[PDB]
Amino acid sequence: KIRLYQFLLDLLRSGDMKDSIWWVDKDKGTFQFSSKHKEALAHRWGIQKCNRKKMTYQKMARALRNYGKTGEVKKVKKKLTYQFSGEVL
Amino acid sequence: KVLRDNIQGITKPAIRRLARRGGVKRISGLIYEETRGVLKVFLENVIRDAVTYTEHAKRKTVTAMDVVYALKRQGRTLYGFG
Amino acid sequence: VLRDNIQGITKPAIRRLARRGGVKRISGLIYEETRGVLKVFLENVIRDAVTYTEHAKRKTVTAMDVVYALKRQGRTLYGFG
Amino acid sequence: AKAKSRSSRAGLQFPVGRVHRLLRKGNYAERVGAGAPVYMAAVLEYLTAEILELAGNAARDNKKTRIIPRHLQLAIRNDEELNKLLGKVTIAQGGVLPNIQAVLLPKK
Amino acid sequence: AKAKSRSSRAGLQFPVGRVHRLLRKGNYAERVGAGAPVYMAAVLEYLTAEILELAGNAARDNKKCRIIPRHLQLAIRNDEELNKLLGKVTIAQGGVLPNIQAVLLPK
Amino acid sequence: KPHRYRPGTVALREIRRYQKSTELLIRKLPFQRLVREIAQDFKTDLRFQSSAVMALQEACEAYLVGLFEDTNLCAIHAKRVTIMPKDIQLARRIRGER
Amino acid sequence: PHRYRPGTVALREIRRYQKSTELLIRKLPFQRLVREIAQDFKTDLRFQSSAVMALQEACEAYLVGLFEDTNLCAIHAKRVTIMPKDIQLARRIRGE
Amino acid sequence: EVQLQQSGPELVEPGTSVKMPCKASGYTFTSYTIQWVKQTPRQGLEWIGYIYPYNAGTKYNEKFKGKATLTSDKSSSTVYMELSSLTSEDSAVYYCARKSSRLRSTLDYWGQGTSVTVSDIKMTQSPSSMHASLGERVTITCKASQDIRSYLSWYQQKPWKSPKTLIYYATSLADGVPSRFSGSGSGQDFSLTINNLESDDTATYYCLQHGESPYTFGSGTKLEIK
Amino acid sequence: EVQLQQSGPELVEPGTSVKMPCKASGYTFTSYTIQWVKQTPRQGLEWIGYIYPYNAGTKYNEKFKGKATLTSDKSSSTVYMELSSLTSEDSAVYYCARKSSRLRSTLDYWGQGTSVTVSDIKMTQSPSSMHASLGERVTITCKASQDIRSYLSWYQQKPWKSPKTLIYYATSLADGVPSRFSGSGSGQDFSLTINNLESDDTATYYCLQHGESPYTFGSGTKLEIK
Amino acid sequence: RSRKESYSIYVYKVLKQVHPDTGISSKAMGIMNSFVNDIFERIAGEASRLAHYNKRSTITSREIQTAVRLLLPGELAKHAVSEGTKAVTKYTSS
Amino acid sequence: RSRKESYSIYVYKVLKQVHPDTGISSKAMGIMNSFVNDIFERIAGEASRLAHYNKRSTITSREIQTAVRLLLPGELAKHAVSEGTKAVTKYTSS
DNA sequence: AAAAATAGGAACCCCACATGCCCTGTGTCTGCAAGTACAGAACTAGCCAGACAGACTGACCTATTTTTGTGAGGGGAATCGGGAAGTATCCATTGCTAAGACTCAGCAATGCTGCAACTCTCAGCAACCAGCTGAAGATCAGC
DNA sequence: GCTGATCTTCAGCTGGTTGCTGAGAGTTGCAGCATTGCTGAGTCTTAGCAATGGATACTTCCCGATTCCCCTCACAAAAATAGGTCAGTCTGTCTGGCTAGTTCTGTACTTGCAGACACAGGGCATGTGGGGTTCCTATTTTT
């Protein structure tokens, strides 16, 4: 399963809806969320998952923090940015 | 042989008689074609079911009991033929 | 003992049922007629269901009995078994 | 011992034995009770008796000494319970009840 | 020899053996043919597959993950053959088709 | 000036006459020809028993008569006395045929 | 102040309630009505919750279909207001 | 549950017309005919006629033809009876009773009676009046004129009260009637028997036949206890 | 028995609008959707849209929305397509075909074609054209872009004629087609095989998928006999 | 010659029991035959369904009585139940 | 505690075969269970009647095919007949 | 200072997935009767044919029914705010439904026999038809 | 509005008849009788769950009064159309006969289904976990 980082990879590789999440370094895998359209990205994630309640960017981001233990997604000291690991790239 | 254009055999006075038995006092001139269409649809349904019943029996003659079965199958039970 | 409970089917509820049926304007006398027809329908279905439960020597009406009554009145209901 | 019909034992005119045979061979249950054919024959006899008495009365009021399908239709359609029981039943050569809507009659 | 389900032999998903047992114990005939359970299981599977595919299409058109009774009702009521087959059938939590008479609409 | 009946009274006379009799109101031969033509499209060279055609005719007369009673009820509802195809369509729709 | 012209809110209600699926009658009044009706046949009866739910759903479906037929009858008579006579005509044609 | 309401007494001068209702409740109104019966001290119970609300069908006694007219109102579940040209011999109590369309059925439930005061088959009851103690056996004979195929019913009428059905079809116990009352007989001979007696049993018992078109009652039997 | 009648050729100047009928007969009109297909010599066959007369529901090709609008006339059993703003690149033959509401069914019967002239899943038909004598085997492949659960049909179109259905559901023979024609395959690869050829079998063969919302035809395959 | 095995003679016996001097036509005879067959099929089928619902394998007089209550309307059910109970009670005494 | 024996797993298998990603709720599951039971009862009862009319004691695939033809409307019957015939042909070859 | 972003503990939900088990579907063999292929009898439905009388058909005129336009008024819709139920959930009680064991009475299965129900027939009579006559009702002036 | 004369139809009576109903002779197939056995149903006991009853707090809806608008209904004119007559025409019906294609009956038999039994795997109930989801608070950076 683990489909969340698959979602985050697919739209970036397909160039879909760059207004919310987009590239600056494809080699290292870092990306930046828009402070405005990240709510739209979270909502589009929630409609795909078809949950009960509309999810906010806070509940979206809560999931990425568990990825640090496994190592797919980690948070660095830079506003609205994360990155995949080399294996999942 | 081949039969063609026989729904016209249900003439205007026949439909008027049927309407009179139903208590209809005045009949519009467009009623006859609509009644012919309705009768054709009803007959097509019943005859198709009866022919299916006859076919399953490996027969070539539609018996009255097949018609009774076809009518009973459609919530139109008929008494007096078996 | 329970009484006059047909008044529990309120006027706004009947208006909602009419709205689901596509009715735009509703006369003032519709509500009593609707209550009457609903009471008749309910009496028929409940009588059949209670007969079904009584045959099984039970004192509790189950969803199967109601489904069976509706089926034997030509009103097959899906989703309850 | 001399054979006594089960119909005579139950005081009936309908065939209890034939009804039992039809129940057994009719694909209804794995087994049929002893009193089930008796009950079935009694109910059938009561129903046919009621319809026949009403139809005979209808024939007599028509000054006829023979029940025809029209008399059966008159007996059934004039009884609300019988009409409800046979609401979806067509009787051949039975005609229809004499009924004219009020608004179709001349006023004066 | 190795046991093989009759459904697998017929290439079906519905249980042929259960259908055979239901036919035998359902007071329908003195005997039941060998191919009758296979035939009727295939028919039931076909009808189930058609209804489920239509309901899934309806659910996807509403951008929903799961088929709920509303989608089944939409699938059946929007198909004339399925509506005729299920004309006298009530579906729980099904609702009604959206339909407004043209006369009620304002000019 | 020959005697003439006002419109409406002959219709009521016919209603009274045809509600008292039980014979078939459609000629037998045209109905049988219609039945054979309809059956031609389901199976070639079919055969019909006379009692089969008679049962079909009885069913058709009963169905049409009941439909005409319902149509008359619909026409009276619309403050009319003349049955029109719209009344037939409404009756058949409410009955569940359409 | 602002006031909607008559029939606009009714059309909005028709669009809204033809889109949803929940029961339009409150559960408690219907439960009380069902128990009261069943009191006539057998005293000290008992109902499963699913039994009352099935009864309510059947009643809603029946009333909605009856109201559709009533609306058709009313439109036939060149009206937009349903009256008891339309209910009676629809029930008579249905065979009830 | 089943109840047939009626109006109160009405005082009418002779030569006029009167009408009384029979508002009925507690059952499917159109499934049961409403039969009208008049009772006078000099004739006893007398059948007038019935009306069938299902199809407005009526049937009148020949001796009451023209005098009485029966109408039905399906909306309010009421049945009216109209008497025209009220003659002096009309000061009596008029009852409306419910009877099913089934031939075996009888007049099961009655109205309270509207005491209106103005300003065939002969059915014979052998014991006119009898006395009994608290626990004896009584038997009432109701020999008929012609032959009726068990279409006979027994009624108990308390004084100043509507009659109550006991036996229908000449043998069947009516609803709520204890098994002390037992009917018997068929053809032309019929009997009503009470095994155990009570102070309640002090009433007048009538036997009614409905095998032929003009329904006829018996003369009655005044039964007294102790 | 089943017939779908159309109109004659249309001579229309650019910039105007034209409507053509698809009068249908021989079957229950409301049970089958009427699908419209356009055919250009340079893009083969393209699916325009369909109308369901049972509820007047439509669904158009995304590249034809606004340009084409479909209307249903239930009384006359006729369906019209209205094309607005006729561009020069609209000169083509417009076919109307009957398709059942069942997912397994396909466009079984076609209209004669209305020639109008003005003054996603991709199907790959690998063999463009072939030559063969009167008795050999021939195989046509319809490799698909995405997967389709056997929702593929094979059509035969004689020149200046409406296409004729051969295979539906990727394996099932159509009505009246001889068993010489045989289709096989599922998923993304499909095949059509002709058992023994005749001088009649020379035509163009298309593969239609209807597994997804925009129906797409194949590139075509011209078969030449001897 | 196939021994159609109808209900005609029993219906004629009942008719002579209720209307001693009234005959019946062949068409009316066939109609009453069809009526008897239809009612028998209805009651037997509904009793079979009742037995199946309660996981019983036998059809008893209880199933027939409940079927009669379910399909006959009004006092028809009451009088048919009375007739059936009387017949069964008399038959049990042999 | 009696192993209710529904149709849920087979309907779920069919659903996952025809729509690999969409799920189904419990209410819709029960509705489709009822649908399968209803269609089974209809076809089986009509085939039983067909066998009874022709004085046959066994229900065969011919009876089921005729029942399907008589009960399903339009192309539903045609496709169901095709599916049943194909399944029986496959089963015969074992 | 404020707000957006980030962490995080702690329940919780959906969909696979695994596991235990138990009972029911499968494999195998046997017996036998349900259904089939075939042949011959019989039977009944389709076709032919001719007359003829009555039902049907189209035109014509008129009356009477439906449609259209108009206007009034009042019935129902739209609104609102306070109160009245409804609802959700939580707990306790109780009662009622079914599982499990035990037992045996009634029902299936079988064979023989006799009489009741079926078929075929024919006499006689209830119903039908034709003719006639009398009452009731529709229709057109008329005072 | 109130009858009155005239014409048409319907209802009733009586004689001839005629096809249809009821009863009798021959017979044959199935209901009744008498055993035998065994299993489905009845009876007791009790586990286990679900329905009922009450409480509490919160949310949702319902009810009555006001205003007014636009829909229904009454009514008159027109304009559409169906019905009643009639002369001419066409077709249904009745009669009977002849195939000949179809249905029914009897045999031999064969093929497939029920029955019995061992057993093992599919399906049901219940559990465990990944990948999130939700919910509320606090903390550390940016705007």
Task: Tell me whether residues E90 and G58 touch, CB distance under 8 A.
Answer: yes
**Run of H or E including D76:** helix D69-77
For residues I23 and I53, give the distance between their C-alpha atoms in angstroms, rounded to a whole number: 12
Tell me whether residue F8 is in a domain: no
**A47 and E66: CB-CB below 8 Å?**
no
H12 to H67, J27, J45: CA distances (angstroms): 15, 56, 60
Residue G33: CB atoms within 10 A of its CB come to 27
The count of other CB atoms within 10 Å of the CB of residue D4 is 9
Cα-only R_g, chain D: 20
Residue F40 DSSP one-character state: H
The set of residues, in sequence order, having a beta carbon less than 8 Å from that of I196 and lying 6+ positions away, is I134, I135, I136, I180
> Residue E90 carries which side chain, given as an amino acid letter?
T
CB H216 within 8 A of CB H121: yes
Helix, strand, coil: what percent of chain K each, to 5? Answer: 70, 5, 25
Is residue D107 in a domain? Answer: no
- Residue I223, number of CB atoms within 10 A of its CB: 19
Amino acid at H108: D
Inside any domain, residue G1: no
A46-60 burial, b for 16+ CB within 10 Å, e for fewer?
beeeeeeeebebeeb
- Tell me how close the Cα of E25 comes to any Cα of chain J, in angstroms: 10
Kindly state the tokens that stand for H144.
């008929």
Closest nucleotide C1' to the C-alpha of F86: L66
Which run of H or of E encompasses K16?
Answer: helix K8-18
- Give φ, ψ of H44 to 5 degrees: 70, -160
CB-based contact E99:G69 (threshold 8 Å): no
Neighbours of chain J (3+ CB pairs under 8 A): B, C, D, E, H
Range of the domain at D76: 6-91
H helices, E strands: number in chain G: 4, 1
Q: Are I208 and I121 in contact (CB under 8 A)?
A: no
Q: Residue B17: CB partners within 8 Å, gap ≥ 6? A: F14, F18, F25
Can you give the residue range of the structural domain that contains J47? 8-92
Exposure class string for G59-78: b at 16+ Cβ within 10 A, else e = bbbbbbbbbbbbbbbbbbbe
Which residues in chain K are immediately followed by a break of C to N over 2.5 Å? Answer: none
Give binding residues of A for DNA as ranges. 49, 62, 65, 75
A and C touch per CB criterion (3+ pairs under 8 A): no
Instruction: Using alpha carbons, select from I214, I117, I165, I212 the residue that is nearest to residue I4.
Output: I165
Give all strands (DSSP E) within chain G, no chain letters: 81-82
With b for 16 or more beta-carbon neighbours within 10 A and e for fewer, the I5-35 pattern comes to ebbeebebeeeeebebbbbbeebebebbbbb
Residue C55 neighbours by CB under 8 Å, 6+ apart: J50, J54, J62, J63, J66
Pairing between β-strand C76-78 and β-strand E66-67 as defined by DSSP bridges: unpaired
| The two structure tokens encoding residue H149 | 């195929």
Instruction: Measure the CA–CA gap between I92 and I38, rounded to whole angstroms.
Output: 7
Between the CA of residue G34 and those of C72, G67, G75, I8, J59, what are the distances in Å?
A: 19, 21, 33, 65, 32
Choose from E27, E30, E88 for mutation: most chain D CBs within 10 A: E27
Exposure string for I146-157, b = 16+ CB within 10 A, e = fewer: eebebbbbbbbb
Rounded Cα distance, A11 and E76, in Å? 36
Could you tell me which CATH number the domain at H3-118 has?
2.60.40.10
Give the DSSP letter string of J7-66. SHHHHHHHHHHH-TT-EE-HHHHHHHHHHHHHHHHHHHHHHHHHHHHTT--EE-HHHHHH
Nearest alpha carbon to residue C73 among E27, G96, B76, E76:
G96
CB J55 within 8 A of CB J30: no
Stated resolution in angstroms: 2.6
CB contact H31 to J (< 8 Å): yes
Neighbours of F93 (CB within 10 A): 15
Calculate the angstrom distance between C1' of M52 and CA of G44.
12
- Cβ–Cβ under 8 Å, residues C81 and C73: no
**Cβ(I53)–Cβ(I79) under 8 Å?**
yes
Q: Comparing C-alpha atoms, which of C13, K25, C37 is closest to residue G22?
A: C13
- Measured distance CA(F86)–CA(G76) in Å, rounded: 8
Instruction: In whole angstroms, give the CA distance from residue E6 to residue I121.
Output: 37
Residue G48, domain member (yes or no): yes
Length of chain K equals 94
Cβ atoms I37, I206 nearer than 8 A:
no
Q: What are phi and psi of I193, to 5 degrees?
A: -125, 140
Rounded to an integer, what distance in angstroms lies between the CA atom of residue H224 and that of residue H205?
Answer: 11
G66, G84 contact by CB (below 8 A): no
d(Cα H23, Cα E35) in Å, to the nearest integer? 64
Q: Number of structural domains, chain E?
A: 1
Architecture of domain C1-81: Orthogonal Bundle (1.10)
Whether residue K86 lies inside any domain: the answer is: yes
Residues with Cβ within 8 Å of residue I128, at least 6 apart in sequence: I219, I220, I221, I222
Determine contact, residues I11/I117, Cβ cutoff 8 Å. yes
Could you give phi then psi for residue E44, rounded to 5 degrees? -60, -45
Phi, psi of H173 (to 5 degrees): -70, 140
Q: What's the gap between Cα G54 and its chain centre?
A: 15
Give Cβ neighbours of residue K90 (< 8 Å, ≥ 6 apart).
E9, E10, E11
How many C-beta neighbours within 10 Å does residue A86 have?
Answer: 9
Is there contact between F82 and strand M, defined as CB under 7 Å from any strand atom? yes
* Domain range summary for chain B, segments of one domain joined by +: 1-82
Phi-psi category of residue K74: left, alpha or beta, with phi > 0 → left and psi -120 to 50 → alpha: left
| Number of domains present in the structure of chain J | 1
How far from each other are the two terminal CA atoms of chain C, in whole angstroms? 31
For residues J25 and C11, give the distance between their C-alpha atoms in angstroms, rounded to a whole number: 57
CA distances to D99, I52, I53, K74 from I31, rounded to whole Å, are: 39, 8, 8, 8
Length of chain J: 94
User: Quick check: G87 and C34 in contact, CB under 8 A?
Assistant: yes
Asked if H134 and H198 touch (Cβ cutoff 8 Å), the reply is yes
* CB contact (8 A) between residue B9 and residue F31: yes
Q: What is the DSSP string of I158-221?
A: -TTS--EEEEETTTEE-SS--TTEEEEEEBTEEEEEESS--GGG-SEEEEEE-SSSS-B-----
User: What are residue J48's phi and psi, to 5 degrees?
Assistant: -60, -40
Distance CA I128, CA H87 (A): 110
Widest Cα–Cα separation across chain H = 51
J5 φ/ψ sector (left φ>0, alpha ψ -120 to 50, else beta): left
Q: I85-124 b/e with 16+ CB inside 10 Å = b? A: ebeeebbbbbbbbbbbbbbbbbbbbbbbbbbbebeebebe
Give the residue numbers in F contacting D (CB under 8 Å), as ranges: 8-9, 12, 15-16, 19-23, 55, 58-59, 62, 65, 72-73, 76, 81
Å from A86 (CA) to M130 (C1')? 22
- The nucleotide whose C1' lies nearest the CA of D4 is M32
First to last CA, chain D: 77
- Rounded CA separation G61/E84 (Å): 17
CA distance E8 to E12: 6
CB F14 within 8 Å of CB B28: no
User: Is B17–F18 a contact, with Cβ atoms under 8 angstroms apart?
Assistant: yes
Amino acid of residue C4: D
Q: Say if the Cβ atoms of J57 and D23 lie within 8 Å.
A: no
CA distance J62 to D33: 10
Is G4 among the domain residues? no
Give domain B1-82's CATH architecture.
Orthogonal Bundle (1.10)
**Is the C-beta atom of D21 closer than 7 angstroms to strand M?**
yes
Helix/strand/coil for J1: coil
Whether residue K3 lies inside any domain: the answer is: no
Do I217 and I46 touch, CB atoms closer than 8 A?
A: yes
Query: Which C residues 35-54 touch E at CB under 8 Å?
Result: none
Angle, vertex CA J74, rays to CA J28 and CA F95, nearest 5:
70
Residue K39 contacts by C-beta under 8 Å, 6 or more apart in sequence?
E43, E44, E47
User: Taking the CB of residue B8, how many other CB atoms lie within 10 A of it?
Assistant: 10
How crowded is residue F29: how many other Cβ atoms within 10 Å of its Cβ?
10
Hey, how many other C-beta atoms are within 10 angstroms of the C-beta on H203?
20
3-class state of residue D65 by DSSP: coil
What is the Cα–Cα distance from I217 to I45, expressed in whole angstroms?
Answer: 6
In sequence order, the β-bridge partners of residue A21 are A33
**Residue A89 in domain:** no
Q: What is the dihedral of CA F80, F84, F87, F93, to 10 degrees?
A: -170
Q: Are the CB atoms for E72 and K32 separated by under 8 Å?
A: yes
Measure A25 CA to L3 C1' (Å).
29
**CATH number of the domain enclosing F19:** 1.10.20.10
**In contact, D49 and H150? CB cutoff 8 Å:** no
At residue H169, the 3 state secondary structure works out as coil
Residue-by-residue DSSP string for chain E: -----HHHHHT-SS-HHHHHHHHHHTTS-SEE-SHHHHHHHHHHHHHHHHHHHHHHHHHHHTT-SEE-HHHHHHHHHT-HHHHHHTTTEEETT--------TTTS--
Beta-sheet pairing, H10-12 with F82-83 = unpaired
Distance CA A53, CA G69 (A): 39
Instruction: State the CATH number of the domain containing residue K32.
Output: 1.10.20.10
Report, in angstroms and rounded to the nearest whole number, the Rg of chain A calculated over CA atoms: 12
CA dist., res. B28 & res. H36, Å (int): 46
Letter string b/e over residues H127-140, b meaning 16 or more CB atoms within 10 A of that residue's CB: eeeeebeeeeebeb
- Per the structure, the complete domain to which residue F32 belongs is given by 15-98
Q: Tell me if residue K3 falls in helix, strand or coil.
A: coil
Indicate the number of domains in chain G: 1
Q: Which residue has the tokens 């970036």?
A: A12
Structure tokens at A43: 């909502």
Number of domain units in chain A: 1
F64: region left, alpha or beta (phi > 0 left; psi from -120 to 50 alpha): alpha
Q: Amino acid letter at E107?
A: K
Let me know if I226 is exposed, middle or buried by CB neighbors in 10 A (0-12, 13-18, 19+): exposed
Could you give the angle at the alpha carbon of H82 between the alpha carbons of H77 and H85, nearest 5°?
175
CB of G93 within 8 A of CB of G70?
no
Q: CA-based angle E65:E71:E72, to the nearest 5?
A: 125
Q: Which amino acid is at B55?
A: E
Torsion of CA J60, J62, J65, J69, to 10 degrees: -130
Whole-angstrom distance, CA of residue A29 vs CA of residue A23: 8
3-state secondary structure of B33: helix
Q: Both tokens of residue H38? A: 């008049």
Q: Return d(Cα E67, Cα E86) in angstroms, integer.
A: 19
Least Cα distance to G21 among G56, G68, G71 occurs for G56
User: What are the tokens at A5?
Assistant: 């980082």
Ordered alpha helix ranges (H), B1-82: 12-21, 31-56, 64-72
User: Cα(H67)–Cα(B14) distance, rounded to whole angstroms?
Assistant: 45
SS3 category, B30: coil
Asked if H37 and H95 touch (Cβ cutoff 8 Å), the reply is yes
**CB contact burial I163-199 (16+ within 10 A = b; e otherwise):** bbbbbbbbeebbeeeeeebbbebeeeebbbebeebee
DSSP bridge pairs for H132: H225
Q: Is the separation of the CB atoms in K77 and K67 below 8 Å?
A: no
Contact J84 D6 (CB under 8 A): no
* Strand ranges for I41-171 from DSSP E: 44-52, 57-60, 68-73, 78-83, 92-100, 107-110, 114-118, 123-125, 129-132, 138-144, 152-157, 164-168
- The end-to-end CA distance of chain H, in Å, is 34
Task: Point out the residue among D90, D98, D103 whose CB comes nearest to the CB of F19.
Answer: D98
Chain E: residue whose CA lies nearest to J58: E27
Q: Looking at residue H50, what DSSP letter applies?
A: E
H190 vs B11, B21, C63, C73, H126, CA distance in Å? 62, 47, 50, 43, 11
Q: Please, are residues C11 and C28 in contact by the beta-carbon 8 Å criterion?
A: no
Contacts of I172 (CB under 8 A, 6+ apart): K82
Bases of chain M within 7 A of a CB of the protein: 7-10, 20-22, 29-34, 40-42, 50-52, 61-63, 69-73, 81-86, 91-93, 101-105, 112-114, 120-126, 130-137, 141-143
CATH number for the domain that contains residue A75 = 1.10.10.10
| Spatial separation of the C-alpha atoms in residues D78 and D76, rounded to whole Å | 5
